[PDB]
Design a protein around this nucleic acid. Structure first.
Lengths: 49, 48
RNA sequence: AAGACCAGGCU
């Protein structure tokens, strides 16, 4: 049944329990932004990493 | 612009400190760049 | 500080 309106769904959906894994990769460890931060010593260019 | 005898090294240029910056380490010592060490060897052997 | 090696991810 549709969660929003309560109407039945015309197609019949395949459902069941399946074993799922959470992986090490998370967005909080990958999100990054830069604006006039640290400057490399030799090239006077933005840092790496 | 280019004369053949200028292709033989008589005067060796020394790059500024910007080209071969010293490595700051905790304020206790500087480590020196490969260019600086090679220039040190060259100066030692030239003096000898 | 910087250099090196290694491991993993997205095509």
């Amino acid at each position: 049944y549709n969660g929003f309106t309560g109407r039945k769904i015309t197609s019949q959906i395949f459902i069941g329990p399946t074993y799922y894994q959470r992986l090490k990769h998370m967005v909080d460890d990958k999100i990054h932004s830069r604006a006039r931060g640290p400057i490399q010593i030799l090239n006077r260019q933005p840092m790496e990493g | 612009y280019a004369r053949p005898e200028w292709m033989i090294v008589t005067v060796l240029p020394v790059p500024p400190l910007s080209v071969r910056p010293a490595v700051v380490m905790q304020g206790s010592a500087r480590n020196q760049d490969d260019l600086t060490h090679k220039l040190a060897d060259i100066v030692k052997i030239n003096n000898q």
